[PDB]
């Protein structure tokens, strides 16, 4: 997260850390007691998932195994598009004060929506934080996203950020949540390199387009 701050502890209780050999490579989002959304580009054959965390280095936190996951069937067709997967935890987690699922937005993004993105990806100073970071970003129009991310803009994507304040997601934030008006709207997916350029929003998986696929998978 570029130009954010430490989140208030446990204020994003759906945040999931995806780690391999105790090293973070992505985040995810707890959407039901047994289900974590993440970016399809975070796919692995198995996962250790940190829940209820603030630091990666805390009563109620859990490390859980997940042995099953499924990428959206059209991931990367076309390139970078449809960037979501569902991870099924090997055991359901009983909701607690610090581990809680978040609902997916019933509305699709529109310009001006106010959002929050969180994660343990790179900071503005190029370091990896130990404490979960949070920053505010606003949705921009589809036409802005299309123009900026020509030739690869696809309706499975939307853009948020791009202010002169240089607030953005960055490497290591993929799969983590973008909460707009209090609902899960997007997952961190991709953006321009470098992250945090003036005027340049990041790109997020457009979850309102996938609620049927997500819930059909959950219920199967």
């Amino acid at each position: 997260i570029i130009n954010g701050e430490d989140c208030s502890p446990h204020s994003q209780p759906w945040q999931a850390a995806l780690v391999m050999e105790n090293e973070l490579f992505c985040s995810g989002v707890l959407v039901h007691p047994q289900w974590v959304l993440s970016a399809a580009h975070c796919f692995q054959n198995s996962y250790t998932i940190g829940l209820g965390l603030h630091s990666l280095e805390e009563p109620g936190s859990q490390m859980v195994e997940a042995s099953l996951s499924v990428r959206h069937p059209e991931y990367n067709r076309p390139l970078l598009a449809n960037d979501l997967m569902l991870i099924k935890l090997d055991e359901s987690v009983s909701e607690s004060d610090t581990i809680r699922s978040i609902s997916i937005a019933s509305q699709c993004p529109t310009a001006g929506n106010s959002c929050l993105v969180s994660g343990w990806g790179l900071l503005a100073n190029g370091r990896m934080p130990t404490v979960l970071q949070c920053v505010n970003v606003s949705v921009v129009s589809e036409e802005v996203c299309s123009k900026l991310y020509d030739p690869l803009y696809h309706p499975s994507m939307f853009c948020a950020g791009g202010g002169q304040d240089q607030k953005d997601s960055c490497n290591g934030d993929s799969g983590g949540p973008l909460i707009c008006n209090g609902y899960l709207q997007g997952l961190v997916s991709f953006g321009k390199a470098p992250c945090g350029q003036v005027g340049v929003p990041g790109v997020y998986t457009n979850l309102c387009k996938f609620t049927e696929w997500i819930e059909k998978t959950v219920q199967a």
Binding site: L152, S174, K192
Partner: peptide, 11 residues
């Protein structure tokens, strides 16, 4: 270019 936050597109 663009990069997943990984595949990059050169542009």
């Amino acid at each position: 270019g663009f990069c997943q936050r990984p595949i990059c597109f050169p542009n």
